[PDB]
Design a protein around this ligand. Structure first.
Ligand code: HEM
Ligand code: HEM
Ligand code: HEM
Ligand code: HEM
Ligand code: HEM
Ligand code: HEM
Ligand code: HEM
Ligand code: HEM
Ligand code: HEM
Ligand code: HEM
Ligand SMILES: *[C@@H]1O[C@H](CO[C@@H]2O[C@@H](C)[C@@H](O)[C@@H](O)[C@@H]2O)[C@@H](O)[C@H](O)[C@H]1NC(C)=O
Ligand SMILES: *[C@@H]1O[C@H](CO[C@@H]2O[C@@H](C)[C@@H](O)[C@@H](O)[C@@H]2O)[C@@H](O)[C@H](O)[C@H]1NC(C)=O
Ligand code: CA
Ligand code: CA
Ligand code: CA
Lengths: 148, 144, 149, 146, 144, 146, 146, 148, 144, 149
């Protein structure tokens, strides 16, 4: 399942351009804040789901750590695209974490996908929307599996 | 276009690729300034003290080193508005008694852009991000 | 999955280059004329959509030039499979060119897809119909975004 | 300890030893093979992630989450507010599991052996011992990590 | 010089070499249009809809693809006068409401020529054959 | 007519072209790619083995069964009794499917293009045409293979 | 048969198998080695070009002319007027030699084996059988090639 | 005899630029018509020698097939430049075919050589008139051997 | 700067590197003259007899060969003032009836300099030595 | 055959580069002066053809400059053996430069050919006189097209 080995290789290389162990955390949450600010403009009713991590102040340490946690999970899924067995278990775990949160709709993940497809070309050299779509959409559906 | 947070990150990575660690910095700076004086030959007179007549001399190559170092500090500070504006004010005072026109800052802008693209390739060069963020830099050096 | 992968893109470009004639229209025209012959035989009312380019006269100069335009458009899309950002822009331009010409629908593109699948193995060596169709459909999906079924 | 210079040093050596792609999973496997070799009793604590088979997708997923947690925490070494918030988050997840803090000492020694073995002789063990204490203190709160 | 049968064969083979199969088409088209707008910066305003201000964008790169595809059809038809003139009339109607000057067609001619020579080498580029046969193409697009 | 010398030649060239290991699966995929390229309508005859996706395990299993049938029949070329017993067994499996015998002509040509393309220029097309006829006559009973 | 698509296909596969330079002579030698192996009686028909020694300059010259004739005829597949004129020209040269048309069947099978063996598994045998019939019919006029 | 191996390699490569098994027949007779039109302008009394192939209409199938036959023979001689034994027999055969035609003078082949030396640089990248002269002149003399 | 003994030695070695033995001389001369006619298109009319309209022709390539050969003789004679001045007088008579302006000699000077730098690299090109010694050559060809 | 082949062209350029001095006229002048010394000794009336360049004074500045011009001309032709299209143009220019100077004939070029054949082995290592002469004659054939015998 998921995406092909050549498509995954493109996504992994392009992702590591802008995210790796050597990237400072400030760049991480700058991307994180751009992503979630864009998400709240598409689905404004989803911002309330993040009250527990102080979304009222996206410059706080609590919300900064949230976006760092989110992008680390996205980085984890990307780097395991060529390991379908492990990626299945990884996305099942992420799905259970999101299902148990009352208020999450599957269309919020659809909106997150569009945010990523919009923000990433601004950061990545020669963004490949086809390879990313082939890999990120099964990733999104696997994480959104079970949400209403 | 605007020099937003995403554009600043992109300009940082592309600059780091083009500027490099030191080996290709001489050729990088030569390509830029050969373009500057070809488009604006009248600008060489401002560089009499650093041998603007001959950009192959060690004297001008050291000036090119200082200019690219100044660009490096600004690019590295694009995500730190407070320190960036302080450094831009320093570059402003370093040019205050020299009468550099706004047209001349745009000439160096285009040369730096051609130099970066020549170093990293037309395939990946982000013209909109570079133009908007260089505008932020030069307008700050112009005391604006 | 039915996605046009990077591997599929490499296969379609080989299947296409092995048959493309870079200097003369002899091959291009024969491929295109055979496809529209197949399409018209299977969709007889499709011939009327090409009255401006002499659809009823497949050997006319007007339809020969149309065939070369279509083949040029497909060549551009297949090559742009390597750069999908630019491909998306080119497929949008092709969509508007086909947009809201009454009888130009998504059903006509599904018909011409089967036309290529019957023409290509007769002219192409090592034809992979599975990989061809996944990327041909990827291309036609962009061409028919704002068309009726 | 763990000053800003040691934090940057640890950040550099981690990024080198951690790598990209499938080398990330290989690093994680060596880390957890050492944890279970240093203390074979700790293996029974991870039956919920099928630690009885370390190549199963369930335990590989656990490995990925843990080293992913190390990566994000190390990346936030330069921002106290974000670092402490995430360490509190990890503490709230580990506290209900009633873990003996001694196994966090085992974890650190297995981490040092794995990073140092991958990075080479220029591995800065005093910097890693000092800055790992900051991590284990945030996750456990145990005075053993002062 | 004239675009005779031998010149048409030569232009066909040299074009096929420069145009290629698809890998180098992006760089090929970029080199051509960077030359066009450098020689004639006033021409960019005609390309507002395809981002003539920024030839690095996917929008303009797709326009460059269509232009080179149009050239490919003409070159491939140089040995078929009847179908060539029909296709040239189509390109004529595609430019009729745009006010392209004869001077601007010559600017693109020279850029395509520099682009082809840059791709295949000054060592083999046949300037006389290319100039004469491009004249046949553009004069037909101009309704002449 | 497929005499004993032609039978020996065909067995020789088949063994070289067929090969070992995954070369056999590759050979089988080329044969059926050619069959469906030579006669696209024959693909619908194999819905029961999921011919819609030739990379599916169901169709790759069918490929292996067919070339295994070719291999075993060709090996029995030198024994009339065993060969004709197996051709009748194959005939009993194909007869209820009501197959147009013309598709067995298409099959022969794809087999020739595959074996010859793998074996090289010394491929004996007349010997293969004569001896494939014996196989097609045994499976279909149609006198177009007489 | 031999439609315009098959003519183009045959044209492509021929150009690949035919090659340039000395590979042209090697292809021609394999073609004629197969003709004389498929029908050893045909060798005595070429004593005028010293077929008793196939590496002699006399028979190499004959090989060059024949495959050169195939090349020009295949190249004219897309122009009926020129193709038929040249086929008539070849017929007027071969008619006084009183050749058994069956050897033109042998020629075609040796051509298929040689092109297919050089080109590989994607060799289109039905297209080559159909379009070679057009050639042999033009040179011989025999109803065996309809 | 004939020409050196390095000269032959140049002629063979440059010839295959414009003539090979993949070149359409239309390009073949376009070159063929240019060559023979140029020959008839130099030696107008030689055009009558081609009445049997309908030279009165150089667009006919008969004359098209003639030039295709001529260029195929020239292609055959070129590709056997490094096989002096076979090329000798090939040119002897071509010579006998031309000797038995009443009206062919040796100077018609001299004129054909000049036509080729004029037309080929218009078609070939970096035409080497020295290598071509070294190889084509013995080719011409071998084919014209015996003509008055 | 002056064309002293040390500058003459440097120009000799750098010229020998750029001019080479013969393989790269065609590209070397093409780069130079493409620069000449781009900066001074009005100069092509003086080269009607050698096809100045098309520098890709064998006729102009042979003229470029003679020009670079003339430069080679002057450079090789820079350390022999007596024979150098005699050869410069010969080049003077070869241009006397052609009305070459001093501005045009400077255009070819800059093209030869760009050509030499393009061949040996900006990293080593000695602009001062080349400008001073080319001035010695051209001023002698101008009968000065 | 006596044709200057591609192989012969490579040999002459090696024989020439091994002796060419790319930076100083010391070698070029010594080669040229020795050739004209040989020519004048064998053809005493040839010295009068060079009155304008002080043929009688081989060490004068006027004849030294002439020698460098001749050597420059031969260097250009030997290098242009790799591109005979341009070579043909250059040899025509040299032909007109020698054309219809009364005593400049094809016999004088045959004499200087023997002059080079005696000078070159004394200065050149691995001198191949056979390959040198075949391409030297190829060059002089173009230089003397419109000259008397
Ligand atoms: C690729 C997309 C996404 C990824 C990789 C992702 C991953 C994660 C991760 C790793 C966590 C932290 C779990 C933990 O350690 O406790 C988290 C928390 C959360 N996510 Fe997602 N997520 C994604 C999309 C979304 C979207 C679209 C929503 C829309 C509402 C959402 C809502 C939440 C919420 C509410 C939390 C908990 C916040 C809290 O701690 O109070 N996520 N997610
Ligand atoms: C656009 C970004 C620019 C940057 C980053 C930059 C940077 C610098 C730096 C670091 C110095 C060294 C100052 C010192 O050490 O005293 C300098 C000097 C100078 N710059 Fe700029 N500069 C820029 C634009 C320009 C432009 C557009 C011009 C004129 C067209 C210009 C003209 C000069 C002059 C005349 C000097 C003094 C040279 C000397 O030391 O004699 N600068 N610049
Ligand atoms: C991969 C499939 C196709 C491609 C690449 C393609 C491409 C093209 C191109 C390049 C043009 C020329 C537009 C212009 O130059 O202004 C065109 C015209 C047109 N196409 Fe398509 N086309 C495809 C399939 C179809 C189908 C399936 C239909 C209808 C069922 C269709 C209907 C038309 C019509 C009506 C025109 C207008 C012709 C005219 O009057 O000029 N096309 N197409
Ligand atoms: C710096 C050291 C450590 C870090 C950064 C870390 C991080 C993590 C992370 C990210 C998770 C997954 C949370 C989730 O998404 O649900 C986790 C789970 C867990 N950790 Fe830790 N961990 C560390 C050390 C330890 C040690 C030493 C032990 C026990 C000896 C331990 C026991 C567990 C257990 C039992 C789980 C739950 C596994 C499950 O999902 O069933 N951890 N840890
Ligand atoms: C010389 C050969 C040329 C060729 C082969 C060519 C080809 C093309 C083609 C195929 C299109 C696409 C038309 C469509 O799909 O609607 C186009 C559009 C256009 N061309 Fe050209 N063209 C040429 C010359 C020029 C020149 C010299 C100019 C102006 C200096 C020009 C200006 C334009 C403009 C303004 C458009 C419309 C862009 C848009 O879609 O907004 N063209 N050309
Ligand atoms: C010419 C040599 C052929 C051989 C040696 C051969 C051999 C076989 C074998 C061994 C099986 C599997 C029987 C079983 O285990 O149930 C099979 C099944 C089948 N064959 Fe053939 N076959 C040949 C030709 C053909 C052709 C030409 C066709 C139709 C165009 C055909 C149609 C089928 C079908 C429909 C099945 C049923 C597959 C299924 O549903 O399992 N066969 N064949
Ligand atoms: C497509 C098939 C064939 C082609 C294109 C072909 C072509 C040719 C050509 C070009 C020549 C030389 C004509 C000349 O320049 O004098 C020739 C001669 C000849 N061919 Fe064919 N040939 C074919 C098949 C055959 C076959 C099958 C036979 C006999 C079994 C045959 C028997 C001969 C003979 C005996 C000669 C005369 C040899 C000689 O010069 O003494 N050819 N053929
Ligand atoms: C490189 C130069 C030439 C080559 C390679 C060549 C080769 C050939 C060939 C292959 C044929 C066909 C023989 C056959 O199949 O029956 C032919 C026929 C002929 N050639 Fe040549 N030839 C050359 C030059 C010339 C010239 C200069 C003349 C001048 C008159 C000439 C006159 C003829 C004639 C009259 C025929 C017979 C036409 C007919 O069939 O009625 N050829 N030549
Ligand atoms: C700067 C160093 C120059 C050198 C070394 C040089 C050298 C030469 C040489 C050796 C010739 C051949 C003369 C002959 O064989 O009759 C020549 C011809 C010529 N040169 Fe120069 N030249 C130089 C500058 C220029 C410039 C600056 C111009 C004009 C802008 C120029 C214009 C010409 C012309 C018109 C010819 C005659 C071309 C013909 O044969 O028709 N030269 N030059
Ligand atoms: C490979 C052999 C030769 C070469 C490359 C050569 C080349 C040259 C060159 C480059 C010039 C200068 C022309 C100019 O700058 O205007 C020249 C002049 C001349 N050459 Fe030769 N030459 C050769 C042999 C000969 C021979 C054998 C003779 C007489 C028997 C001859 C007679 C002359 C004369 C009379 C001049 C005129 C000198 C003057 O007054 O300037 N050359 N030659
Ligand atoms: C939002 O938060 C900004 C970040 O400051 C850090 O986080 C806050 C929550 C405190 O913990 C502070 O001590 C940290 O330095 C603040 O700078 C900013 O003032 C806050 N904005 C508002 C409106 O409260
Ligand atoms: C010359 O021939 C042209 C080519 O047409 C083809 O050849 C002729 C001989 C006929 O066989 C014809 O059926 C073929 O299509 C003709 O188009 C042209 O009209 C002819 N010219 C003259 C003056 O008769
Ligand atoms: Ca600006
Ligand atoms: Ca024009
Ligand atoms: Ca000057």
């Amino acid at each position: 399942e998921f995406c092909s080995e050549a498509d995954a290789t493109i996504v992994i290389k392009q992702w590591n351009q802008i995210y790796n162990a050597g990237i400072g955390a400030k760049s991480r949450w700058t991307m994180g804040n751009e992503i979630f600010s864009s998400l709240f403009k598409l689905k404004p009713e989803s911002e309330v789901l993040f009250n527990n991590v102080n979304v009222a102040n996206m410059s706080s340490g609590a919300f900064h750590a949230h976006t760092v946690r989110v992008l680390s999970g996205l980085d984890m899924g990307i780097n395991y695209l060529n390991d379908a067995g492990t990626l299945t278990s990884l996305t099942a775990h992420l799905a259970a974490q999101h299902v148990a949160r009352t208020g999450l709709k599957a269309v919020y993940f659809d909106a997150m996908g569009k945010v990523l497809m919009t923000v990433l070309p601004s950061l990545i050299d020669n963004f490949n929307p086809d390879a990313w779509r082939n890999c990120l959409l099964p990733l999104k559906n696997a994480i959104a599996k079970g949400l209403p | 276009s605007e020099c937003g947070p995403l554009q600043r990150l992109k300009v940082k990575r592309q600059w780091a690729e083009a500027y490099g660690s030191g080996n290709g910095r001489e050729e990088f700076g030569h390509f830029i300034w050969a373009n500057v004086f070809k488009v604006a030959p009248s600008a060489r007179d401002m560089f009499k003290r650093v041998r603007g007549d001959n950009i192959y001399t060690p004297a001008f190559r050291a000036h090119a080193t200082r200019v690219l170092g100044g660009l490096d500090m600004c690019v590295a500070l694009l995500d730190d508005e407070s320190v960036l504006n302080t450094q831009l004010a320093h570059l402003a005072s370093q040019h205050s008694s020299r009468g550099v026109s706004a047209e001349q800052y745009n000439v160096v802008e285009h040369a730096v852009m051609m130099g970066v693209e020549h170093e990293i390739g037309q395939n990946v060069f982000d013209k909109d991000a570079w133009q908007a963020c260089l505008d932020v830099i030069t307008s700050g050096i112009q005391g604006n | 999955s039915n996605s046009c992968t990077t591997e599929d893109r490499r296969e379609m470009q080989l299947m296409w280059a092995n048959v493309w004639s870079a200097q003369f229209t002899g091959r291009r025209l024969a491929i295109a004329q055979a496809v529209f012959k197949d399409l018209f035989a299977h969709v007889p009312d499709a011939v009327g959509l090409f009255d401006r380019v002499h659809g009823t006269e497949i050997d006319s100069s007007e339809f020969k030039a149309h065939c070369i335009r279509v083949v040029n458009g497909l060549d551009s899309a297949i090559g742009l499979l390597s750069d999908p950002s630019t491909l998306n822009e080119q497929l949008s331009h092709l969509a508007t060119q086909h947009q809201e010409r009454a009888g130009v629908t998504k059903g006509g593109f599904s018909a011409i897809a089967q036309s290529f699948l019957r023409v290509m193995p007769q002219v192409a060596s090592c034809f992979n119909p599975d990989a061809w169709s996944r990327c041909f459909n990827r291309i036609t999906n962009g061409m028919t975004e704002g068309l009726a079924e | 300890d763990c000053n800003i210079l040691q934090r940057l040093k640890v950040k550099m050596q981690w990024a080198k030893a951690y790598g990209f792609g499938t080398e990330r999973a290989k690093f994680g496997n060596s880390l957890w093979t050492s944890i279970f070799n240093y203390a074979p009793d700790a293996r029974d604590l991870f039956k919920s992630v099928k630690s009885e088979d370390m190549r199963s997708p369930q335990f590989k997923a656990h490995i990925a989450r843990v080293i992913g947690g190390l990566d994000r925490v190390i990346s936030m070494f330069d921002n106290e507010d974000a670092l402490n918030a995430d360490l509190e988050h990890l503490k709230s997840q580990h506290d209900p599991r009633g873990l003996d803090a001694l196994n966090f000492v085992v974890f650190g020694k297995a981490l040092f052996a794995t990073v140092g073995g991958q990075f080479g002789v220029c591995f800065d063990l005093p910097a890693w011992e000092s800055c790992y204490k900051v991590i284990a203190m945030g996750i456990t709160g145990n005075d053993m990590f002062s």
